[PDB]
């Protein structure tokens, strides 16, 4: 678990990249993500089958 805060959570370089396969947001939308402000974002990275 890594805490991300006090920065700009840009996603243009994230969504536009085609190197990813599946990317779904069940609570928000990428279009309105830019105009949305977050307090703290935690990134949990793991490798699974």
């Amino acid at each position: 678990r890594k805490r991300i805060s006090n920065c700009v959570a840009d996603y243009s370089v994230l969504y536009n990249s085609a190197s990813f396969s599946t990317f779904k947001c069940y609570g928000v939308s990428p279009t309105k993500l830019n105009d949305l402000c977050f307090t703290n974002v935690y990134a949990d990275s793991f490798v699974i089958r």
Partner: protein, 49 residues
């Protein structure tokens, strides 16, 4: 039901379009593309629900 639209529809408006939807900057030519989703999604109605 319709899940994605270019903009909010005016009151008492019917949208029967079946054209695919693009959720990013990349173009969506033809009937499919990268991150191209069909705007019409079925309903999961079951008696057990």
């Amino acid at each position: 039901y319709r899940l994605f639209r270019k903009s909010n529809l005016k009151p008492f408006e019917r949208d029967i379009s079946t054209e695919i939807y693009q959720a990013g900057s990349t173009p969506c030519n033809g009937v499919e593309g990268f991150n191209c989703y069909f705007p019409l999604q079925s309903y999961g109605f079951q008696p057990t629900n």
